[PDB]
Amino acid sequence: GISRDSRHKRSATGAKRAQFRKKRKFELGRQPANTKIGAKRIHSVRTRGGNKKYRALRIETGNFSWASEGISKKTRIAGVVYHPSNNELVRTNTLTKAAIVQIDATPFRQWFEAHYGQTLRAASAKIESSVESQFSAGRLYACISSRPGQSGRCDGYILEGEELAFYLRRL
Amino acid sequence: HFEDRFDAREHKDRSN
Amino acid sequence: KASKGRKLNYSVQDPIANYEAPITSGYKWSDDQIDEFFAGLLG
Amino acid sequence: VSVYQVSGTNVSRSLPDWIAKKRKRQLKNDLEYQNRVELIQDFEFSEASNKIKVSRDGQYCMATGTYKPQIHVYDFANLSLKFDRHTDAENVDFTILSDDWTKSVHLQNDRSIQFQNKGGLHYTTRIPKFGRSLVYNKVNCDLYVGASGNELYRLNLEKGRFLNPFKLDTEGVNHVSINEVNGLLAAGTETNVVEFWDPRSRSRVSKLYLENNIDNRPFQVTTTSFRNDGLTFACGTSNGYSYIYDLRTSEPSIIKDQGYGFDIKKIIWLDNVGTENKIVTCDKRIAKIWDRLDGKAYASMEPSVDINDIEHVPGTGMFFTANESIPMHTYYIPSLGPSPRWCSFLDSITEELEEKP
Amino acid sequence: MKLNISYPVNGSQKTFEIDDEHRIRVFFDKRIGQEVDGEAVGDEFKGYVFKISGGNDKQGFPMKQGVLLPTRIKLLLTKGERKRKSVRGAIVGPDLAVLALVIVKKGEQELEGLTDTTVPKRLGPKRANNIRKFFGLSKEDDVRDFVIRREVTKGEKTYTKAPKIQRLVTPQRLQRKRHQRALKVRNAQAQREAAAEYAQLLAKRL
Amino acid sequence: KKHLKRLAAPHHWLLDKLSGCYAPRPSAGPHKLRESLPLIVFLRNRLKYALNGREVKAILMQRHVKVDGKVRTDTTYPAGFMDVITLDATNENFRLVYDVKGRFAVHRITDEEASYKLGKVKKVQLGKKGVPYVVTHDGRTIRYPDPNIKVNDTVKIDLASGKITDFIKFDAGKLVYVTGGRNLGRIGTIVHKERHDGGFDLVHIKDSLDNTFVTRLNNVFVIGEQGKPYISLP
Amino acid sequence: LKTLSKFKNIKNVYSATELHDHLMVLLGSRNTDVQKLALDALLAYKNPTLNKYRDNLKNLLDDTLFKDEITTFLTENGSQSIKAEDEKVVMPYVLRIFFGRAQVPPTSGQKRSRKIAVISVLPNFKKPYINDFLSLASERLDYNYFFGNSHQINSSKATLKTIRRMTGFVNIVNSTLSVLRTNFPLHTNSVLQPLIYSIAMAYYVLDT
Amino acid sequence: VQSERAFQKQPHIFNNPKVKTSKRTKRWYKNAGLGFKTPKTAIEGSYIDKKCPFTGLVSIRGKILTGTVVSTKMHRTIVIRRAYLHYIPKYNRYEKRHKNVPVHVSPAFRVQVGDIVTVGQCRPISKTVRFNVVKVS
RNA sequence: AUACAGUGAAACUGCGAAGCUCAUUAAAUCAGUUAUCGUUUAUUUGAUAGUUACAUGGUAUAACUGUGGUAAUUCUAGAGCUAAUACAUGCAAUCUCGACCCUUUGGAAGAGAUGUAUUUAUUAGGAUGAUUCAUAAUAACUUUUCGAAUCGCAUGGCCUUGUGCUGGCGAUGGUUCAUUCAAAUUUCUGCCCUAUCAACUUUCGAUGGUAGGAUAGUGGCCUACCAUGGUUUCAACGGGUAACGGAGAGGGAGCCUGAGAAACGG
């Protein structure tokens, strides 16, 4: 039912265009994969050619990157906190790219202890105060940069600096 | 705008 | 605002006309009984 | 009480079902594969199920799926899938207008109401704002859709026009329910209030403030349900507390805590089963059966996978649950009532059934 | 009615028509997978146990597993393509024209047509390890001398015929593996020569 | 589509329009369909060695035909510009060069000339593992090229090894062959390159008769220096 | 051992304790099939803490679910994580299991990734239990004679087999050091003296 | 700059909060070619524009056109008008025509109603926009 | 031919299956041309992967043997076999800095270094007019891909006589790039009368921005918020036409395969 043709739309000068022909599958569009937190469920969908896409209908895990210290750890997703496009996804906790989610700070916490030998050499161990507060609370804010609906992955990166402040004010 | 396309009619003889 | 259906439209829609017919029997309890019980709803 | 899981995955909660399908071809030598029995053929969705409803006639059932967003209809008399039909978007709430499966109305997540006839999709209509619930008034044939905003939309099915929308004091309608005996509509608002609305007129009969002494946290009215008696009214909260109210008095007669703190997804009134003083309250993990008067716990339903919805086959002890697994789970409690007609010889195989506690 | 009884250890099978209804009644209400004692079926079957495996009705349609009914139903079955076809329940009833049974254990008396007769295996092992398993051959022992042969006589001509063993270790397989390895090594060496020549060219240019 | 009318066949093949209903479609290969000469047309309609497609199949099946030093058995293999065709039985070597009219001419060459070909550098870029390579007009991917080689240059490829023996930079005063347009098949020396970024680059070419003409860069093929072509011209 | 697992009363055999000691070693064997067998006989011994978490131990031995099991089962503060009282009984089995997985050679990308997964779960463990895991790898290495005497090398111990075992030890410690780093637990007996012992072996082997 | 629900940033460009070498956030920019000087306001600007020819992921290729600005009321795009004399052979005479082209304009350019803008063709930006402003005058 | 070896029914694999009949439509069909740095692409062509094994399992069955039901079909259930390029599993090297400057090509102590594919983050940045392009590196991720358990012909060179080591020409497979065959969008141009057709659009998106969903990808194509825009008397929009001068396979709805079809298949 979903189609990508521009024929059904109105013209630039604006004549209501008449249907030329029946819908073709080479402008095919598919349904939104409303990814959500929980036990991993991914489906394999056959696309044009021999290429394949992965449909993460459900996912509770993601490889999230601490860009400042340059690492990437696999963490549990806690839930969606803010999504810039529409708040209903936040209310339904739908997982999509650019959605602000809450992730596991435990592996990052252990890693920090191991590499700097300090709870959360000293100057390097110093980090932003807000992120320290996030670790003390035990919940870490992150932004999804992968598309679960195309690659089947929920990778992301930890919010920091200006982006973190902007999203905190938005929250 | 210049087409820069070869045409058969010009090359073929029109003597007849 | 009207575009995409974000505003409610009160015009007729032909396909949905007469999709179902009302049941003339109505609620099992009589109308006066229903009116009485709502007036006392939650004290 | 003995509760039997006739159909559903029988693996550990940690183990996913797709691994079981992987393990399926290795275990095919195992005698258990030959012995195990399925009730309805193709009684599974590819990834997960959202909901499940059974026809009033009692020979047909209907469900929807995650991917491809689909609408399975199962014939009880034939023990098979009648047909499969996709949907452009995922499905949020539906009700079956006709006694059979021929006519149904779906509330999708793209804010579009679609009417599905026997031949196929008839028309799609779009409501102004996102909807979370959908109920049909049989007397007036008016379709009511709860919405994210305060307004509650009115579509009259006779005349084919969007009528004036009921305006609610508070924003967000989670669940709407209509009493057959009285026609009273109880709207489950986001705030801790249930607003009762007048069907023939457009008025608020009363608005009830739910109160919990145990928890001071805010809670959201997730579900509302009316009994066929016309007087007792049930409420489900986001904190896992189910309240039964006699509509005449403000105070709650009984308050029950499910114990897991999850939202109550549905409440089912087991009047038809016999021993009418029974009620089912469904959470994400447990669907619990208990009596309205004493509050005592009789039977607890503990599937290995999260429950999205539960449905009771009228007049029988069969329960149908929509879960996140490939096979939806169907359960039988012999004590509650006899097995359905189409499940005539389910009784013969009760000893072989799992009989989970 | 008719019971098609199969005793698999020999691979034998035979049909018995039972006119009296007593036997058919003791078969009634059972399920494909349940076991029934032979003594109830008859003294000739005394001590036997029968596993019910399926059957066909008076209308010819089979019985199918997974369905607990005594009556006809149309199920959507696959022979990906699926067709809706009529099938019988797994429940034994008076509408069954033939029931198939499997002898789980033997009784006191020996059946004339099943226990007293044998049918040999049609074919023997083909793969080398399958032959070794069939003859318990040690690794040093060669399967080549233990290949099962069948004699064929056409008129006055006679000859023995044996199968082609598969996955057998042979010189040509070793030669192919060695050739592939040598080809890989040669390709790597040629690539290194090309890289070295390119490096020399760059050194000249710089 | 998959069938070609003779009336719709390319003009440059010289094929008579009335011989039959249909013409050969060149198969997939190094050259474009509209810029290739299938071996059936070359061998039957230009060489006259064969009389119908069937003798062409027999000849190719005898493995008597080599295109760029390798045996070809496909009837419709797309031989094209700067392709060397060797027939060992006849001791004949041919190079496909357009005449002034714009058609393939069956130009006989010596063995040394057959040993090498020229390819215009279509693309210069590094592949996986940081290995530079060049893609020529005939689709040859040659790794580890000389750094000075750039796009629009011409590389002399040895057929036996498929390696660049030498190269010519694209510059004014270089000898040039026109491979498209109305000036197709003409030869001349570059005068100036009129660069229109985001558009088709134009080159001015002066012939030995001092006549000047302008042609798009995509139809330009450097073949040597003025008075010293690297190939025997027709 | 498959016969051993189905013994009805394994705890009452003539020699249960030292049989349990050898089974504990087979649980640490590289071959997962031996670990599956070895666990089954260990599970034949009746112990309530084992039966509660029997499924998790089986899932670890399964290769397909090995990764997801670690993230859910062994993550500290996890809902499915072992209870504090049950830590003492369960972890000894845990260490030998992951010790066996670490023994698995990294001849493929899949096999390599499982070693990073095995070594990455040590920070979840509490420190003496991490010390236990290091101690298990050092049990095979025979170093007490070296430090017992005047730091002298025995010719018999100097073999290709001995060096291979030491190469395995040093690789495990290096991976542990990379993960734990400053939080690495350092003990003389468990790690340092096998580590020093191995360096003495390399010098003795190279010169001799 | 941050006047939207989402956070505006140049993709794959990173500013490391710890290192804090420079107060200014790292900015990526390119020259569009065609002898079009990239303006200094784009180089040292703070705007984020995915469709800017100098800082966005858009490339100018194909036709280059010129026109007169007729409308600048909508956000980050304008409508320009190009006129010409079309030949009628039957009368052998010319008639004036005009056409209106919508063109994307980056915030690095300040355009009024009446000035002359040279524009470069690029990939489809929107339903009707196929060009991008590259020089104002 | 004492493993078979010629030919070979059946069956399992591999490849390819992509004229008619109705309607009618004004540069929205079609023709020319531009771009894809915005994309997929079987096949052809050129390059391209050193990271139990003298060869593993049925975790397997067809054809086939035999027992039967049915009025009955390209309808069928039970029992017993047997294989793969079908289904799964899977295995003592090289390159640098190079003291000793020992010998001055040279050896050489010691230090080191060493797949590919997807996703995210980060660093460096030969090609084009232009790139976040190409490539490389780091930290991880993956229902982590692939990296010959295949076949035909020939039986050479060596010796350490063991059937020991080392091997010639092809076929069928496989990652990535380019090429070729195509496909899909896209820039500009292109002879009817027209105002007795002057407003059209937002009429469930109309013009644009931000973010998201989906495509093979750009893009209101669709979705959430925001601005009220866009064409037009230089003819928008609408109407007529010698605009034969695009649709379906009993009728609508839906699904499946494959490189390519919403398939004249199911």
CATH, residue E185: 1.20.5.2650
CA of D245 to C1' of I257 (A): 57
At D110 the three-state DSSP class reads coil
| Non-local CB neighbours of G136 within 8 Å, separated by 6+ positions | G28, G95, G96, G99
User: How many beta-carbon pairs under 8 angstroms link B with F?
Assistant: 13
Among E120, E146, E171, identify where a domain stops.
E120
| Non-local CB neighbours of D304 within 8 Å, separated by 6+ positions | D8, D9, D10, D11, D12, D13, D325
CA distance F217 to D220: 72
CA distance D241 to D259: 8
Among E104, E120, E136, identify where a domain stops.
E120
> Contacts of residue D42 in chain E, CB cutoff 8 Å?
76
Q: Could you tell me which chains touch chain G, where touching means 3 or more CB pairs under 8 A? A: A, D
Q: Report the CATH architecture of F170-234.
A: Roll (2.30)
CA distance D26 to D20: 10
How many CA within 13 A on the CB side of residue D231?
A: 10
Distance of CA F36 to the CA centre of its chain: 8
Same domain, E129 and E116: no
CA distance F210 to G42: 98
Placement of tokens 């089947």 in the chain: A152
Element (H, E) at D245: strand D241-246
Same domain, E39 and E18: yes
Task: Check if residue A52 sits with its Cβ under 7 angstroms from strand I.
Answer: no
CA distance A58 to F128: 36
- Token couple for D138: 């049989």
Same domain, A144 and A160: yes
List residues bridging with A77 in a β-sheet.
Answer: A103
The answer to whether D241 touches D212, Cβ cutoff 8 Å, is yes
CA of E175 to C1' of I174 (A): 21
C-alpha triplet E41, E42, E44: angle, nearest 5°: 130
- Token couple for E190: 């040629």
| Non-local CB neighbours of E81 within 8 Å, separated by 6+ positions | none
Q: Could you tell me which chains touch chain C, where touching means 3 or more CB pairs under 8 A? A: D
Same domain, E116 and E129: no
List residues bridging with F189 in a β-sheet.
Answer: F175, F206
Q: What is the resolution of this structure in A?
A: 6.0
Same domain, E13 and E94: yes
- How does strand D121-126 pair with strand F187-194? unpaired
Same domain, A25 and A43: no
- How does strand A61-66 pair with strand A156-158? parallel
Among E85, E120, E155, identify where a domain stops.
E120
Same domain, E146 and E66: no
Task: Indicate the residue of D79, D344, D349 with minimum beta-carbon distance to E75.
Answer: D79
Closest CA to F217 of A70, B4, B10, A110: B4
Same domain, A101 and A159: yes
CA distance F160 to F140: 13
Q: Quick one: closest CA in F to B3, which residue?
A: F181
| Non-local CB neighbours of D23 within 8 Å, separated by 6+ positions | none
Same domain, E179 and E96: no
CA distance A37 to A103: 11
Q: What does the DSSP 8-state code read for residue C43?
A: -
Answer whether A4 touches D (CB < 8 Å). no
- Token couple for H130: 């196929």
Residue E59, Cβ density class (10 Å: 0-12 exposed, 13-18 middle, ≥19 buried)? exposed
Q: What is the DSSP string of F38-101?
A: EHHIIIIIIS-S-SSHHHHHHHHHTT-EEETTEE---TT-EEETT-EEEETTTTEEEEEEE-TT
CA distance D289 to D307: 15
Task: Check if residue F219 sits with its Cβ under 7 angstroms from strand I.
Answer: no
| Non-local CB neighbours of G15 within 8 Å, separated by 6+ positions | none
C-alpha triplet A58, A63, A66: angle, nearest 5°: 140
The answer to whether A159 touches A100, Cβ cutoff 8 Å, is yes
C-alpha pair distances (Å), G126 with each of A67, G67, G101, G116, G135: 28, 20, 20, 19, 14
Cβ of D345 within 8 Å of Cβ of E91? The answer is yes
What distance in Å separates residue A114's CA from the closest CA in chain G? 5
Could you tell me the residue ranges of all domains in chain F? Answer: 1-112, 117-167, 170-234
- Token couple for A67: 């860009």
Placement of tokens 């060069």 in the chain: F97
Closest CA to A59 of A153, A157, A141: A153
- To the nearest 10°, the Cα dihedral for F210, F212, F215, F221? 10
| C abuts F (3+ Cβ pairs < 8 Å) | no
Please give the nucleotide, over all strands, whose C1' is closest to the CA of residue A2: I222
The domain F117-167 having CATH identifier 2.40.50.740: the answer here is yes
Q: What does the DSSP 8-state code read for residue G141?
A: S
What distance in Å separates residue D317's CA from the closest CA in chain A? 30
- Dihedral sign, CA of G86, G90, G92, G97? negative
- Dihedral sign, CA of G96, G99, G104, G110? positive
Task: Check if residue D33 sits with its Cβ under 7 angstroms from strand I.
Answer: no
Please give the nucleotide, over all strands, whose C1' is closest to the CA of residue E191: I48
Same domain, A7 and A59: no
**Strand I contact residues in chain D (198-227), C-beta within 7 Å:** none
CA distance D160 to C20: 10
Residue type, D97: L
Same domain, E28 and E105: yes
E128 C-beta neighbours (distance < 10 Å), count: 19
Cβ of E74 within 8 Å of Cβ of D80? The answer is yes
Same domain, A159 and A85: yes
Same domain, A45 and A55: yes
> Contacts of residue E31 in chain D, CB cutoff 8 Å?
348-349
Q: What is the DSSP string of chain F?
A: ----BSTTS-GGG---TTS-SB-PPPPSSSS-GGGEEEHHIIIIIIS-S-SSHHHHHHHHHTT-EEETTEE---TT-EEETT-EEEETTTTEEEEEEE-TTSSEEEEE--HHHHHEEEEEEEEEEE-GGG-EEEEETT--EEES--TT--TT-EEEEETTTTEEEEEE---TTEEEEE-SSTTTT-EEEEEEEE--TTS--EEEEE-TT--EEEEEGGGEEEEEETTEESS---
Which of D 71-90 lie inside 8 A of E, CB atoms?
Answer: 77-81
Q: What does the DSSP 8-state code read for residue G192?
A: I
CA of E206 to C1' of I109 (A): 33
CA distance D222 to D170: 14
- Token couple for A133: 């507060």
| A abuts H (3+ Cβ pairs < 8 Å) | yes
Cβ-based interface (< 8 Å): residues of A facing G:
40, 61, 74, 76, 106-107, 110-111, 113-117
Q: What does the DSSP 8-state code read for residue G186?
A: -
- Token couple for F96: 């496909």
Give the range of the structural domain holding residue A14, as residue numbers without chain letter: 1-30
| Non-local CB neighbours of F233 within 8 Å, separated by 6+ positions | F97, F107, F187
Same domain, E101 and E68: yes
Answer whether D27 touches G (CB < 8 Å). no
Same domain, A25 and A35: no
Same domain, E101 and E137: no
CA of A32 to C1' of I178 (A): 36
Buried residues in B1-16 as b, exposed as e (16+ CB within 10 A): eeeeeeeeeeeeeeee
Cβ of G59 within 8 Å of Cβ of D22? The answer is no
Q: Quick one: closest CA in F to E197, which residue?
A: F144
CA of D74 to C1' of I262 (A): 27
**Strand I contact residues in chain F (34-63), C-beta within 7 Å:** 34
Task: Check if residue E118 sits with its Cβ under 7 angstroms from strand I.
Answer: no
C-alpha triplet F150, F152, F153: angle, nearest 5°: 60
List residues bridging with A73 in a β-sheet.
Answer: A64
C-alpha pair distances (Å), D6 with each of A16, D43, D320, E63: 56, 12, 10, 21
Same domain, A43 and A14: no
Same domain, A43 and A10: no
CA distance A109 to D342: 58
CA of D244 to C1' of I216 (A): 56
CA distance D186 to E181: 78
First to last CA, chain E: 99
Q: Supply the Cα-derived Rg of chain G in whole angstroms.
A: 18
Residue F112, Cβ density class (10 Å: 0-12 exposed, 13-18 middle, ≥19 buried)? exposed
For chain H, domains (ranges, CATH) are 1-137 (2.40.50.1000)
E197 C-beta neighbours (distance < 10 Å), count: 12
Task: Check if residue A162 sits with its Cβ under 7 angstroms from strand I.
Answer: no
Task: Check if residue E41 sits with its Cβ under 7 angstroms from strand I.
Answer: no
Task: Check if residue A71 sits with its Cβ under 7 angstroms from strand I.
Answer: yes
CA of G157 to C1' of I111 (A): 28
Q: Supply the Cα-derived Rg of chain E in whole angstroms.
A: 31
Give the range of the structural domain holding residue E115, as residue numbers without chain letter: 1-120
- Token couple for A138: 């035990």
Q: Could you tell me which chains touch chain F, where touching means 3 or more CB pairs under 8 A? A: B, E, H
Cβ of H127 within 8 Å of Cβ of A85? The answer is no
CA of A20 to C1' of I23 (A): 13
F1-112 belongs to which homologous superfamily?
RNA-binding S4 domain (3.10.290.10)
CA distance A123 to A126: 5
CA distance G28 to G92: 10
> Contacts of residue D15 in chain G, CB cutoff 8 Å?
59, 65
Answer whether G65 touches D (CB < 8 Å). yes
Q: Could you give phi then psi for residue A100, rounded to 5 degrees? A: -85, 120
C-alpha pair distances (Å), A103 with each of A65, A135, A156, G51, G124: 11, 11, 10, 32, 18
| Non-local CB neighbours of D49 within 8 Å, separated by 6+ positions | D63, D64, D65, D66, D308, D309, D322, D323, D324, D325, D328
What distance in Å separates residue D15's CA from the closest CA in chain E? 25
The answer to whether F67 touches F81, Cβ cutoff 8 Å, is no
> Contacts of residue F11 in chain B, CB cutoff 8 Å?
8, 11
> Contacts of residue E92 in chain D, CB cutoff 8 Å?
none
